[PDB]
Structure 1
């Protein structure tokens, strides 16, 4: 470098060490002054990092170099200067540098290796040498570079690289060992699978080198290695098959050794558990996995209240978790996670082997562990455990009264957890055992913690319990809870209100009885602490819905005044209890809520207009942004961004409320429609960083319109604007799940707006969208390994609905546009995948409903007649509907296919009368009825397919046909077929039936309804003439 340039830069870089003023002035000087100067700058920084005797200037420059060298980018730098930079970086690497500085140099060096950069064989050479050096930092830094630039591993000969790693795993220095494992795993996460087989063979050497960490007593470094192994399990789990037992035994050995700090024990646990989420068949196919996993998690769940046998510290604290009980927390999460993926099929057996034993221990901690374990495993093992339900209770319930309060707490938990997972059946089956068990823990005999948790478990039970079931226990429940309501400890009171609220909600009208006593108790609590009052307001309004409007009107005025007071006073936890309550009041009050809207809607507008709160961010500036629970950072296209997730979630919650206020208030909400639509709903579709927002935007739209319509041109303008943005969204939306919502949104918009609601260029734009959607679905489904083991159907289901909706609004004229995507539709018709076929068949049925299709008759009836006898009942359904619709709307142009296939329909009609294909065979039934109308032995067949109870459109026709077959001694089957249809709510046919009964004796007539029970005879009386 020119001599002047040096001291200019040397001054500036020295200004970087320091104060804000001197350091910002330098920052500006660099960003303003230093594309004429980039290569000078790069050259300078690289020299500093390499040769400066000043630690800090060196580090800084190395860091700066790295940053600026991506930004450059390095590709566009002069070959002449690249070479010089590369050489000085390399010279510095090989000289005498502080450990931290070699790390920084390494990372700068990494920025000078790129696929399209000129070859740098000097680096390879310096690495190969460095790996052999007796200075650990040389070895460590070399693996590091291979971690950043894994492609360098391909550049080395295989017979050099393999020994390099085997030496790596084995090295004297722990630091080197961790870097080698990191480099090894990094290889798999940066290279394509085609390259994996090439390092794969090393896994053994790595695994074999593990026990050495324990020998040297270097478990903290072991944890780091376990973490890299955990990544490799996500990438290539199969690779561990057949060394499987050796890692299982080893993790077992580590977790059991309980004078290891927890890090090595919890990461070893994670390693174990992660296999179940990445290779379930492998885990299932080894008896030893499930056995070790269960054994090991049970041991860990034992590690509670250490140095505190009485649990004194725990009784005194609140019902939040002691997150200092780390290994216990990890163990239950683990058991849960594994149970979920492997099922009870696989672990009931081993689990119970261990439960039986610990339930009866003299160590309380073990009796506890047993409860917590069952509780953690219950969801996952639902499949097996739902039928060993009394067995569970028999083991659990004895402990409800255990000497030790934490075992009691534990017992309450299982009872609660079980109530949820095995619902609704457990409510029906075990109320007699569960409710007394829990209710008995409410009494002040028991400790605060237990009382509260028993009350918690009662919410779980109540959610899915019938009012009828709960009724006998209510007085008992209520009296006990009111005691807790008077508790001294905030958390007991809070839980008592929430338990009351949720019991009340379940009880409905059976809670009317208790309204008078509870409500003023509640009002006094309110008049007297945020969560308490909010939980109280929640309880009050849940009770209010349970009892209905009239009854709730006894206190509603006062209640509302309190709400207002609460809303407008000086925790954001309360805001939500308030919001939910106002909303619950509107469900109670119906139209009477309207005067309240100007209190309630303005804060919701503000929240629901929050912008996409985004920070275009820098590499290091992310991990600290990630510290916040309220934030998440992602990468869009290499360049990263910080998105305020909490805020965006809040916007959704606000939108949901605006949407339900609109749904309940209908016409009354009209005043807001313009503002919500243009300032909330529509802009929300452009929220590419959060799909909840996008979705809530879409679902809002048709409900908005429907509100304005019910009140009353602007409606047309809005609808045009909205439908257009939805349509344009169909092409730009990346998530298929969202795409579905847009279609569903359009369908509902169309249903609101009525006839011809769409312009020609709209229709054309919708078709490009539909085409792009069908194209993207095909490409995803043409997907389906050596190392590894409904959203599409739902999307297509909706696209069928939107197409039908569009055809209907255009009254046919969309057929023109529909011709453009017939190639698409055709490919689908004759693919293999039954999903694409069903889609096409359903489109086709829509086309025929609107004799102008002959163009195509010869193209799809071959496939439809195939489909008729398909193994797949959803396919038979689609096909037969097509044939039915053919004879109905296109009678002469399809007479030739319809009548032949008529035999097929008598055959398809014969597991027909099952639930799973009741759907299919009902369409066939209707299809033949349609043919018999358009144009005698056959019609007698048709009758033997009544009644139609599941499909509404089918049923509609069959009984219209049955009514014509009459007006122009099967009598009890005739009547029954009809009674069944109405009773099953599937579908004047009655007028025809009456006439038939007219031609009979009073006594013959009456005997037909001998069969029917009271409840349906109440209905029969009210159906007849």
Structure 2
């Protein structure tokens, strides 16, 4: 009895129409257990039956599409072929005879999903009936069948296995014909969207892009026609094309640009359409800047449009009385125009944007309208970052003109001027502060103290915060008194008003300003401490209600920053009371969500108090460690939806969606990610500060941070998780080697896997640095055989990638659009690659130092790439690091390194005379380390190395700030060769020349070595150093005194004592000491006295 089943199905669909929770649950429970084949047959029967209400049919079609796209793998295979053929034929029949547009589109979606899920293998359609139907559909007479074909093509652009072989011409003809009719506009829009989708799907295909260039005029005409009918569906397609594949527009780019300008200048369209038209050009500038830079006229015409967008300010009288930082909008014309100006200035560069916007800004800053002045000040604020280098030499007049607008008849213009000053202080730092502090600080303080408007005061205080944050401490001390005054009186007044009224806007900014001033003044804030702590605590004890939570958090942060600045000594007199306040706050507020503003201010406050209270803080660790760990391990809500379903969730509570490939939507909730990053960073700080006292919580933090390496939603979380790795090992070292081994077994596999997987270059470099540090912590047996094999494979892959990226960048050059800015971008990529090579060398050095001679068979597989790095035609950054790796091999894997000497020894000897100072330094260090840890095998090469080193040293331009370090390394190498291999040096002839080159002052670990050699020669006997009697002693004393200056560390290093004792060894007879010291500068005498006193 199918009639009863159909009646029940219609009843449950009607229930689903207006569900409520009861029949929601009951219908879900009933539906989730229905057999798949029966489900398919019933849904097809329901779709076929054109008798029930449209809602039931649409709902059932949505069910069929969702069921297919979700679980096609279990409701299609292992079923009779008759059923499959019947359902395919039924779908085609429903498509053919459907009349209503919405239902036809839904069944088209269903059929496209089926064809997508029925491709299989390497790609070949198993449903030729579908392709045949599409072809006889698009070339038909009735418009419904053509719409069905075009929607099927748009939904899955790619129902083909041999499109290039035969079907490309047919596709192009079909699309061109469809974008030609004049009786049915709906066909033109659908064909334009289908063309955009087809081009987007077939990315990275230059031949297709050049073959489909004739369709661009039709696409532009279609989007022009559709935008005038309140339909921006094709404009979104144009934005997507410009975002993903801008090269497709290269044939007709100018035309496209003009269209956008028209669509951006037409006032008839609503705000969204004009903003999308502007976004076309903005996205083109962001993505393909080299293509856009050739059309300067379009930019010069689009800048006035954006400037005229920002004049679209509504006169609001409920402005001066606003007590909250209400969100701007991100929809109004002014904010969208300002953001577009910022993005285009950042993308195109200042060299092009600045000349055409500067005159407009200077002309608008004179129009008596209070809106043109506001727009000019906001444009000056917005173009600050993008036109950084070009505006650096013009800052004087811009600053002098902006500071004149703080004294303006209109409050909103003064607000804009404060915004401009603050943003310029942020962008042009720290050069803005040094050349303009005297006027900027005075103007901002005058604006803050004397004002009747309470929104100009807060923004002036924020500008002062931005200014003082980056201001160096040296030039702020003169202004400390004049800041503490005019910051304390205003606090007193605003705190008085907070008790009676409910004003909090300017008090928060004043509190943050005081916190910033104290933070950047450090220990100089002591005399003013008593001026602020009694009041600030008064804010924390009060302000317990709601809508003051941000004020309480800011006050607590200010208290913590003031305490950290004044230090532990002064803070430990109100520290108990502040501890009680923080404990009470923590026990009180811990009942709200994770977006509560007191959840990122309390954690940082606890970390700052830990920094202040060192080891005494261990008492409060159980209390803080609860909520911090709770908010450090929150799982963001993620949902994988369909694109047709993503629209339907337009509530937008915070969901961030991304259009995944092939009709899918991937959404994550970015609510609490920043709190997670802050909590992870504070865990890192806690471990670093506590060390041995963090051992109780080490296991939990390890088990939490190890998964966080593969947390691609936030880069800060991954960076913090990588950084915490060696600190936790150092914390767990206390419990013994077994605990260290357990933690290392937790971390090693995850770190190795994350090294060879991380997309980001910065995060990857941090991960490799952390892995190298962890290996350095645990030596001689920290890696298994599996870890060794995986590391070898990953490092070989990284070196191959580094070699291939150079060729890829070279191919990127010599392009149709290559200019200076493209070269700068390529240089930045090269710098990133060199940084990754640096981290690879760091890992190799750690492994070598830990394993010694036992690791050379593992290094055999990496040897060819390292030899490739030292090729003479390679750039100096590659050769330097190849030589560094070979130097590590020599230092730690000898005397077995002779097996590899044929690969590097001749390049090492040759590169000592290189033009690049870094390669010279690397070669000199290799030659020096050859003698110290090389044994008798490298004896004959020292005789060859010595003359080259002395020639390099004695050449001119050796002590200049560039070649100085290489010369110091060469001196150290010659000293090492003299000491450890004196048989083949003829020391009696080199040492008198060597004494001339001494001392070393900017290379620290070579300076200790050379001074150890000097002491060893002095402590032993006469040769060279002390000739006839003691007449040579004054020059060695002068050398020591000259080298005193922060070179031999005065912390009683073993070398320095051996030096100091020598100074006290001669300090027995006054006759010699007087004549040795009579020819020294007063600074030299003071240096000798300090050296004698220090050790």
Q: Cα distance 1:749–1:157, how it changes in 2: closer, same or farther (>3 A)?
A: closer
Q: Cα distance 1:1020–1:98, how it changes in 2: closer, same or farther (>3 A)?
A: farther
How far apart, in 2, do the equivalents of 1:696 and 1:22 lie? 47
| 3-state DSSP of counterpart to 1:297 | helix
Q: Cα distance 1:557–1:984, how it changes in 2: closer, same or farther (>3 A)?
A: closer
Q: What's 1:346 paired with?
A: 352
**1:288 counterpart = 2:297:** yes
**1:315 counterpart = 2:309:** no
Q: What's 1:665 paired with?
A: 690
Q: What's 2:270 paired with?
A: 261
How far apart, in 1, do the equivalents of 2:722 and 2:171 lie? 59
Q: What's 1:12 paired with?
A: 9
How far apart, in 2, do the equivalents of 1:117 and 1:99 lie? 27
How do 1:860-939 residues align onto structure 2 when only pairs under 5 Å count? 860-865=904-909, 867-868=911-912, 872-906=916-950, 913=959, 915=961, 918-933=964-979, 934=981, 935=985
How much does 1:436 deviate? 1.0
How far apart, in 2, do the equivalents of 1:700 and 1:861 lie? 39
How much does 1:543 deviate? 1.3
Q: What's 2:826 paired with?
A: none
8 Å contact kept, 2:1001–2:1043: no
Of residues 772, 778, 799, the one that matches 2:800 is 778
**1:401 counterpart = 2:407:** yes
Q: Cα distance 1:12–1:326, how it changes in 2: closer, same or farther (>3 A)?
A: same
8 Å contact kept, 1:526–1:533: yes
How far apart, in 2, do the equivalents of 1:189 and 1:147 lie? 11
Q: What's 1:956 paired with?
A: 1008
How far apart, in 2, do the equivalents of 1:402 and 1:583 lie? 43
**1:849 counterpart = 2:895:** no
How much does 1:493 deviate? 1.1
Q: What's 2:103 paired with?
A: 101
Q: What's 2:43 paired with?
A: 45
Q: What's 2:821 paired with?
A: none
Q: What's 2:188 paired with?
A: 177
| 3-state DSSP of counterpart to 1:260 | coil
How much does 1:339 deviate? 1.8
Higher relative contact order (CA 8 A, sep 6+): 1
Q: Cα distance 1:586–1:902, how it changes in 2: closer, same or farther (>3 A)?
A: same
How far apart, in 2, do the equivalents of 1:399 and 1:728 lie? 57
8 Å contact kept, 1:298–1:373: yes
Q: What's 2:769 paired with?
A: 744
8 Å contact kept, 1:730–1:769: no
Q: What's 1:982 paired with?
A: 1047
How much does 1:810 deviate? 3.5
How far apart, in 1, do the equivalents of 2:1077 and 2:716 lie? 59
Q: What's 1:596 paired with?
A: 620
Q: What's 1:302 paired with?
A: 311
Q: Cα distance 1:432–1:822, how it changes in 2: closer, same or farther (>3 A)?
A: same
Q: Cα distance 1:453–1:866, how it changes in 2: closer, same or farther (>3 A)?
A: same
How far apart, in 1, do the equivalents of 2:969 and 2:700 lie? 46
How far apart, in 2, do the equivalents of 1:95 and 1:118 lie? 24
Q: TM-score, normalised by structure 1?
A: 0.88
Worse overlay, 533-542 or 802-811: 802-811
Worse overlay, 946-955 or 537-546: 946-955
How much does 1:97 deviate? 2.2
How much does 1:140 deviate? 4.0
8 Å contact kept, 2:200–2:244: yes
**1:198 counterpart = 2:205:** no
**1:543 counterpart = 2:543:** no
**1:151 counterpart = 2:158:** yes
8 Å contact kept, 1:340–1:380: yes
How far apart, in 1, do the equivalents of 2:486 and 2:712 lie? 51
Of residues 506, 509, 527, the one that matches 1:495 is 509
8 Å contact kept, 1:625–1:632: no
How far apart, in 2, do the equivalents of 1:121 and 1:979 lie? 89
| 3-state DSSP of counterpart to 2:1081 | helix
**1:186 counterpart = 2:194:** no
8 Å contact kept, 1:470–1:507: yes
Of residues 163, 168, 174, the one that matches 2:179 is 168
How do 1:986-1025 residues align onto structure 2 when only pairs under 5 Å count? 988=1056, 990-991=1059-1060, 1002=1074, 1005-1009=1077-1081, 1021-1024=1089-1092
How far apart, in 2, do the equivalents of 1:169 and 1:972 lie? 94
Q: What per-residue deviation string (whole Å, max 9, x for no partner) do you get for residues 778-810 of structure 1?
A: 246524267987554334323332332333334
**1:236 counterpart = 2:245:** yes
The total of aligned residue pairs comes to: 1002
8 Å contact kept, 2:512–2:554: yes
8 Å contact kept, 2:729–2:744: no
How far apart, in 2, do the equivalents of 1:843 and 1:476 lie? 56
How far apart, in 2, do the equivalents of 1:666 and 1:204 lie? 67
How much does 1:122 deviate? 5.7
How far apart, in 2, do the equivalents of 1:148 and 1:908 lie? 70
Q: What per-residue deviation string (whole Å, max 9, x for no partner) do you get for residues 856-895 of structure 1?
A: 1123324444554556544443333222221221143223
How much does 1:819 deviate? 3.8
How much does 1:922 deviate? 4.1
How much does 1:199 deviate? 1.3
How much does 1:271 deviate? 0.9
Q: TM-score, normalised by structure 2?
A: 0.82
How far apart, in 2, do the equivalents of 1:943 and 1:269 lie? 71
Q: What's 2:606 paired with?
A: 582
How much does 1:651 deviate? 3.9
Q: What's 2:523 paired with?
A: 509
How far apart, in 1, do the equivalents of 2:904 and 2:108 lie? 65
Q: Cα distance 1:664–1:626, how it changes in 2: closer, same or farther (>3 A)?
A: farther
How far apart, in 2, do the equivalents of 1:1017 and 1:333 lie? 62
Q: Cα distance 1:594–1:767, how it changes in 2: closer, same or farther (>3 A)?
A: same
Q: What's 2:827 paired with?
A: none
Worse overlay, 372-381 or 985-994: 985-994
How much does 1:553 deviate? 2.1
Of residues 107, 111, 131, the one that matches 2:113 is 111
How far apart, in 2, do the equivalents of 1:473 and 1:334 lie? 38
